[PDB]
Design a binder for this molecule. Structure first.
Ligand SMILES: CC1=C(/C=C/C(C)=C/C=C/C(C)=C/CO)C(C)(C)CCC1
Lengths: 100, 98, 101
């Protein structure tokens, strides 16, 4: 039912949060696009609910970015890259620890 | 904050539902696109969270439609959401409260 | 702490899934308002993250009702809010509902 979709959305949201926290924790220059792609990739592979959550969260982030001044297209490109099932590692900065 | 964002989202959502409510309350001559634009326009006026909310609701609506046209609604949605005037789609003599 | 909020939200989500699951198993007449109320009650008790998760889930449910048929919604939301505010879910308990629920 809609329950299963929502559970996937819930999982997808956590994948999104996981990507965000791992990115602060890593504090690695030019890592953002990797984590954006990775969070959307992980989330979408939870199923339709996860892919929906990743999009909704990504657009919420874009909206806040716009409001505060900037970039955004590049981020959304990385977002959609991972969400479509493409490898986030194409954005992986050299030396990024294997645990991320 | 994101408390502020979420507030705007709540308000924007209400503007949306209120748009959809009004529309049923008016079984109309070709009234669709006006209500869709107005909801988004109202919702976007609340701020970023409202614009964001209007978009998730619009896209969701469209998604459910995809088992039952959709693009023309989406044009009207983005019209209002961008701030362009919803009355552009007003039908012939639509009651004043809408 | 975002971590704590996220932890409460996860718990509250589980409380919500547990209510819906319990509702299904029980298959008891006139019982949805109880489970709607109970899920929000248990969720809100987790902390702000839980109350928030329960609202997001309740509002998403209402949204899907409206797009399709399920639409009554106001009555469901009244129960949701009732439980989420901390009021007794048993206010909606139908006669005979097994005690474990
Ligand atoms: C009020 C409001 C919401 C309602 C969302 C909807 C409409 C959820 C249903 C989605 C479905 C079924 C999508 C199918 O692709 C939530 C709380 C989520 C966030 C802010 C806007």
């Amino acid at each position: 039912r809609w329950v299963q979709f929502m559970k996937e959305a819930g999982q997808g949201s956590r994948d999104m949060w996981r990507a965000y926290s791992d990115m602060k924790k890593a504090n690695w220059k030019n890592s953002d696009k990797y984590f954006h792609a990775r969070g959307n990739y992980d989330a979408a592979r939870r199923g339709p609910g996860g892919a929906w959550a990743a999009k909704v969260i990504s657009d919420a982030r874009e909206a806040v970015q716009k409001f505060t001044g900037h970039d955004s297209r590049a981020d959304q490109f990385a977002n959609e890259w991972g969400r479509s099932g493409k490898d986030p590692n194409h954005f992986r900065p050299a030396g990024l620890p294997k645990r991320y």
